[PDB]
Design an enzyme around this catalytic site. Sequence first.
Site, short mmCIF file in Angstrom:
data_model
loop_
_atom_site.label_atom_id
_atom_site.label_comp_id
_atom_site.label_asym_id
_atom_site.label_seq_id
_atom_site.Cartn_x
_atom_site.Cartn_y
_atom_site.Cartn_z
N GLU A 1 26.09 6.60 -9.50
CA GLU A 1 26.58 7.99 -8.65
C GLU A 1 26.39 8.10 -7.53
O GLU A 1 26.83 8.76 -6.37
CB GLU A 1 26.47 8.78 -9.55
CG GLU A 1 27.46 9.94 -9.41
CD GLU A 1 27.26 11.04 -10.89
OE1 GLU A 1 26.58 10.73 -12.12
OE2 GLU A 1 27.73 12.14 -10.43
N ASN B 1 2.22 11.35 1.70
CA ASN B 1 2.75 10.95 0.63
C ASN B 1 2.82 12.33 -0.53
O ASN B 1 3.85 12.46 -1.24
CB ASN B 1 1.40 10.77 -0.11
CG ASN B 1 1.18 9.08 0.68
OD1 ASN B 1 2.13 8.67 1.33
ND2 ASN B 1 0.07 8.32 0.12
N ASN C 1 7.89 8.18 9.08
CA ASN C 1 6.11 9.35 8.79
C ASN C 1 5.94 9.85 10.79
O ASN C 1 5.32 10.72 9.82
CB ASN C 1 5.28 7.97 9.30
CG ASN C 1 4.92 6.88 7.44
OD1 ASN C 1 5.21 8.22 6.35
ND2 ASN C 1 3.99 6.66 7.34
N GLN D 1 0.55 -0.75 0.07
CA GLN D 1 -0.12 -0.19 0.06
C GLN D 1 1.11 1.21 0.01
O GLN D 1 0.60 1.93 -1.03
CB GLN D 1 -1.41 -0.06 1.24
CG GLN D 1 -2.13 1.17 1.23
CD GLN D 1 -2.86 1.17 2.46
OE1 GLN D 1 -3.19 0.29 2.84
NE2 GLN D 1 -2.97 1.97 3.16
N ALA E 1 -0.96 -10.12 3.29
CA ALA E 1 -0.52 -10.28 4.17
C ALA E 1 0.03 -10.20 5.28
O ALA E 1 0.28 -11.07 6.48
CB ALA E 1 1.85 -10.16 3.74
N1 LIG Z 1 3.55 7.46 4.30
C1 LIG Z 1 3.21 6.66 3.72
N2 LIG Z 1 3.21 5.39 4.96
C2 LIG Z 1 1.69 4.36 4.35
C3 LIG Z 1 1.30 4.60 3.41
N3 LIG Z 1 0.56 3.51 3.49
C4 LIG Z 1 0.92 2.37 4.64
N4 LIG Z 1 1.95 3.22 5.14
C5 LIG Z 1 2.58 3.01 6.23
O1 LIG Z 1 2.88 1.73 5.60
C6 LIG Z 1 2.66 0.90 7.62
C7 LIG Z 1 1.74 -0.85 7.02
O2 LIG Z 1 2.01 -1.31 5.82
P1 LIG Z 1 1.25 -1.31 4.00
O3 LIG Z 1 1.86 -0.09 3.60
O4 LIG Z 1 0.28 -0.17 4.69
O5 LIG Z 1 0.97 -2.49 3.85
P2 LIG Z 1 1.99 -3.78 3.01
O6 LIG Z 1 2.62 -3.33 2.35
O7 LIG Z 1 0.52 -3.16 1.90
O8 LIG Z 1 1.09 -5.19 3.16
P3 LIG Z 1 0.34 -6.33 3.38
O9 LIG Z 1 -0.68 -5.22 4.03
O10 LIG Z 1 0.03 -6.58 5.35
O11 LIG Z 1 0.10 -7.39 2.82
C8 LIG Z 1 2.39 1.51 8.23
O12 LIG Z 1 2.96 2.04 9.32
C9 LIG Z 1 1.46 2.36 7.77
O13 LIG Z 1 1.56 3.99 8.29
C10 LIG Z 1 0.96 5.78 3.17
O14 LIG Z 1 -0.13 5.67 1.70
N5 LIG Z 1 1.80 6.68 2.87
MG LIG Z 2 -1.98 -3.95 2.52
#
Ligand SMILES: Nc1nc2c(ncn2[C@@H]2O[C@H](COP(=O)(O)OP(=O)(O)OP(=O)(O)O)[C@@H](O)[C@H]2O)c(=O)[nH]1
Ligand SMILES: [Mg+2]
Lengths: 423, 54, 436, 314
Positions: free
Chosen positions: C253, C227, C205, C11, C99
């Site tokens: 680089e 974002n 974050n 995500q 996951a």
């Molecule tokens: N800056 C930012 N952080 C994000 C975003 N989406 C999720 N996070 C951060 O990512 C972490 C959660 O992991 P995710 O990326 O949502 O999960 P994933 O990689 O999709 O893995 P699963 O959902 O478990 O399959 C948390 O610490 C969130 O704060 C985003 O759009 N922007």
């Molecule tokens: Mg996810």
Amino acid sequence: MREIVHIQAGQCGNQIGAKFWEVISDEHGIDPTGSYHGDSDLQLERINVYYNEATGNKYVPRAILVDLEPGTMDSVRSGPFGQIFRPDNFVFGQSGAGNNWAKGHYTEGAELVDSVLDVVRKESESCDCLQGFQLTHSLGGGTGSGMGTLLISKIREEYPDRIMNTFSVMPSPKVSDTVVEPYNATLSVHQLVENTDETYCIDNEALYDICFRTLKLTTPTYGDLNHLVSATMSGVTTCLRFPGQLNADLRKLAVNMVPFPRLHFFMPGFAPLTQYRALTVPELTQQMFDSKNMMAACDPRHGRYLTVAAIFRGRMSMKEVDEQMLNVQNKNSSYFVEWIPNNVKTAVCDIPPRGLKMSATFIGNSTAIQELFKRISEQFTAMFRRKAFLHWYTGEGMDEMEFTEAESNMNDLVSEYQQYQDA
Amino acid sequence: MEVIELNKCTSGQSFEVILKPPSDPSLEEIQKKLEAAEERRKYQEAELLKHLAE
Amino acid sequence: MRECISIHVGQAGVQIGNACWELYCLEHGIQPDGQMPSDKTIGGGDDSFNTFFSETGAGKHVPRAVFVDLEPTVIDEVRTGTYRQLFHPEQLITGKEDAANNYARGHYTIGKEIIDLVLDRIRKLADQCTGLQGFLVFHSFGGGTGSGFTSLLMERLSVDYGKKSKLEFSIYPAPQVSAVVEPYNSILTTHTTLEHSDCAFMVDNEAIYDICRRNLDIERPTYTNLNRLISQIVSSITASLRFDGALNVDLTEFQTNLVPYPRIHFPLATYAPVISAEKAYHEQLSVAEITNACFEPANQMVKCDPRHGKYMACCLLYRGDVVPKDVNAAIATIKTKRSIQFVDWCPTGFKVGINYQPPTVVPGGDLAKVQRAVCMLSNTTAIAEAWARLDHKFDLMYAKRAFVHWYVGEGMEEGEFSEAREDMAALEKDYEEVGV
Amino acid sequence: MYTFVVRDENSSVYAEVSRLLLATGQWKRLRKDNPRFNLMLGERNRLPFGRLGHEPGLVQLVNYYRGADKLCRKASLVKLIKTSPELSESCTWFPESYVIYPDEREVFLAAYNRRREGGNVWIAKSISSEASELLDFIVHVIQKYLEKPLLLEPGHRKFDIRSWVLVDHLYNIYLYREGVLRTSSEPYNSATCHLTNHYEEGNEMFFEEFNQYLMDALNTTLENSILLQIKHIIRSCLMCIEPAISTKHLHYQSFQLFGFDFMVDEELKVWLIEVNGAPACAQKLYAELCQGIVDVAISSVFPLATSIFIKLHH
Ligand SMILES: Nc1nc2c(ncn2[C@@H]2O[C@H](COP(=O)(O)OP(=O)(O)OP(=O)(O)O)[C@@H](O)[C@H]2O)c(=O)[nH]1
Ligand SMILES: [Mg+2]
Ligand SMILES: Nc1ncnc2c1ncn2[C@@H]1O[C@H](COP(=O)(O)OP(=O)(O)CP(=O)(O)O)[C@@H](O)[C@H]1O
Ligand SMILES: Nc1nc2c(ncn2[C@@H]2O[C@H](COP(=O)(O)OP(=O)(O)O)[C@@H](O)[C@H]2O)c(=O)[nH]1
Ligand SMILES: Nc1nc(NC2CC2)cc(-c2cccc(Cl)c2Cl)n1
Ligand SMILES: [Ca+2]
Ligand SMILES: [Ca+2]
Ligand SMILES: [Ca+2]
Ligand SMILES: [Mg+2]
Ligand SMILES: [Mg+2]
């Protein structure tokens, strides 16, 4: 599509279950005949989690109604929203279970379980991506308790990699149908320890005390008790039914709430306990963590929170939410284990429940829950020491050794909580 | 303070300011780990289904 | 012209990837339909922006990107977003179920079933490259996919693309905007990814959140707020790759300028100025002022104190009305008024890059258009504070094996936990030595 | 309500501030490892400054300045004064010192040679008359021994001036109006009476009496003859390292209590001996000084439902 398959077994299970569907159907704008009349698209985004699309834009709850007697299932079919359930999904016998765990699990229940597993299969086979199952039942009776857990065992065998959650009503002498409820509950808890990922512990004693003391209801009914349960059930599933992704699916929330596989029994809580004035965010927060608003007849100030999940509903300020949430724990961080950092998670949802500008639901994994199992174990042992009422079960083919093992298993569970309450 | 390697083009420029001089796993090895993890899952499931069959 | 392939995982990686490519298109004059009038080499050419964009016969500029996620929720927003026309289906990859914030699940269980498909889609992008120079990998530390599947992908990428550089943009877990097991996934993916990443930019974050509240007056910033700020910082880092210039023109680089020791490949990023868009009248900060802000911890992508570490390399990327004269005057004045200790075995200096185009902002956004900004990439040992924090939280839970059963149940074994932790302990030691 | 955590049971001073904090019904003593705290009374060594200021919704304050050790270590203090343009070549109040590991092992003998040609006693630690004796004893620093110190009468005894200075989160510099002298109580022999580390109760003399002595024995005052020099040395040392330790725009706050040890020669000139980062107090003064710590340093950041300090402005 993250579909969930709902199962409700027994009298209590089908009465809690029936009102749950009545409540969330309302929130999602589904009329008693499955037609949607909602004024917002948020209602239909995650409608697939609990409903199926039927011909004519009809939404049919993905629920299976189970019981060894007809009657509770005849009333549901005649009650409000009874027309909304698939007729094929009523699976019932005629004998009943006589409030007997053995009859639900071994004799009467075994005769009917394959018919239920046929409906469960049919529902699962048409799921884009089955998320898991949720079961509503009591532990004090016979069908929901004995057959309900037999179902869970059969379901795990056939869907070993799907989540299994239950809303389980614990018995209490203060709201008791028969004297054997400690036997049926002790036998069921061991099943739950093994075969569920999350069990929402709804203690009929707490439900009663809330109606008597807080709600000041002289002489409460099961309807009153079930009013608090459906409101709780609506809150805990809010994040599953509306846009948002903090404990978004069943597995995710299990991963964040259960640090040890056997300690997956949760204390519910709700606020405001239900007139025209809306609580402020401070009022919601303080009440939600108050013992009096706890639905497991356990004082969390006697144990420590492993993990906590709080859900706020209604248009409010997330800032004040954080201010009070961070406030209540920073002011009582003696009741949170220090070896799970940031173990309190907060979720917010704009859609408030029916007739409330804003509310808060509480899901806590506290070691104080051992008190509830202590209650059951002491009541079980009071009778088992004298083998009282045991003939009802040996007459169904059970041996005394199976009771001894259940007793040992729950005592083990209790000590497994005290271990982490002092670590 | 010495400017060096000053490069200039139409969209900007770049240079370096010096203020003081100074005083792998195989595709097969990965499969082995992945298949090993799968094996341990299959075993834990086998014990579960055997537990249930009992 | 050497191509760069971007990979967005989970995500956070996908949503951040969306924000970057929206900014890239505005920066390069590419409309949502995927074509830019300014491009006179229709269906071809090897300009600087072509390192990130392919071209079709219809004058379409298609990002050299791949979006990978184990559930379709987030990537579906790409298929239906304002820039859906940019991408074609082959570069959007979604599984059925995610996951569940479980590294073991994303790496082992689900990862093994999708890794070949992702590599196939990436191969079809590589085959389209005359001189692919490497990959940019976006992902979260805390997500099950971002942590678990990313490290598997990085392992295979080192196998299939040995001679290629790999950079990371990593979202470091912050409890203000999060899952309780994120420290586990963070250490697990760092241990497994360490020897496969040439240069990794960590974005905490917690820092983005506080910059949004402090500078943008956003009371409760959302991922969209977070974002769009991260994309600005990513853009100014990748700007040298898609514009004419002389500093950081290929992925190698970045390593050469920022990473003397391979394991210590996590440069700290500081950005300025971040100015609220509600402020119609706001004084335009000078070169000296924004350069000075690059040394205020409140502007860093990771909250830490560089005053109590040591620098190995420091790189200044300016965007807008900047001339070398002002930079040097700004650097001369800052040197005598701040604590800037370089390691003995490295020269005390700054590599400066100026791009005259002022930073682009998303119309209808929170960031105010400014006349000049800077991003400082400095490899300081102070960033080891972030590893120490994360390693401490890991230690607290792991001492009780809390949640461990979720990973073991997915095929992992406890040995990987302690092994990954020991690697992190040696990583903290490496910063300790360099920073004495 | 506010929450703090104790992590140095040995601290005489902060055991008292923790007692006052509780005596207000508005501070809660947490487990030493609970991170959900407002104030840390941290440990003396290896304090994990890197884990501070990362708890959401928590304004966190700690009682030590990360980096203040450069001032509170014998060697680094000598190194700081010599290499600091703010102090070097302008430090007429710090005896010439040298750092030599068991480095400036050569430059020491340089000025030392001229001495014997022309007073040439030195002292080293971390008191002899020839460099050979010193090096055989021995990281150690060595500085000229003040051969002609101001001696109190009667007793013909040398003293030791200790000043307590409080630096709050805003980097205000507060000097406790109460100081103490540490008297040897042994006649000074130019050829126990040389050391003054712990006639007057407790072998310590407070300011009111020392001032009267000066007015009687020397027709001057403590303020004019010595305090002006004290304040100047305190401000010089603390302003020098302000850019390196200030928590002005930091994600956590710092304050700290310092013990400056001075010495006075025959000409009523004040010399800086060393700076202690973890000083104790005079029993007769724990009450007032520890309450002042709470007033200006703690409850200034966490407020509750004259002044014993002299604010050295800058
Ligand atoms: N800056 C930012 N952080 C994000 C975003 N989406 C999720 N996070 C951060 O990512 C972490 C959660 O992991 P995710 O990326 O949502 O999960 P994933 O990689 O999709 O893995 P699963 O959902 O478990 O399959 C948390 O610490 C969130 O704060 C985003 O759009 N922007
Ligand atoms: Mg996810
Ligand atoms: N250069 C010098 N000339 C004369 N006397 C000196 C001196 N340096 C130190 N002394 C004497 O040595 C004694 C100890 O000073 P020192 O500060 O080195 O002890 P110390 O720092 O180990 C313990 P404290 O923290 O209480 O000062 C003092 O009482 C002082 O009188
Ligand atoms: N809260 C609640 N509890 C119930 C309800 N019906 C029964 N119970 C409780 O459930 C237990 C009786 O089990 P029951 O469900 O009637 O037996 P079953 O039909 O064989 O499953 C006792 O502890 C009752 O107090 C109900 O509608 N609401
Ligand atoms: N851990 C968790 N979290 C949830 N959501 C809120 C935190 C946001 C909902 C649930 C849940 C879901 C289905 C059935 C039952 Cl009994 C439960 Cl308890 N569990
Ligand atoms: Ca029969
Ligand atoms: Ca059959
Ligand atoms: Ca072209
Ligand atoms: Mg009944
Ligand atoms: Mg000392």
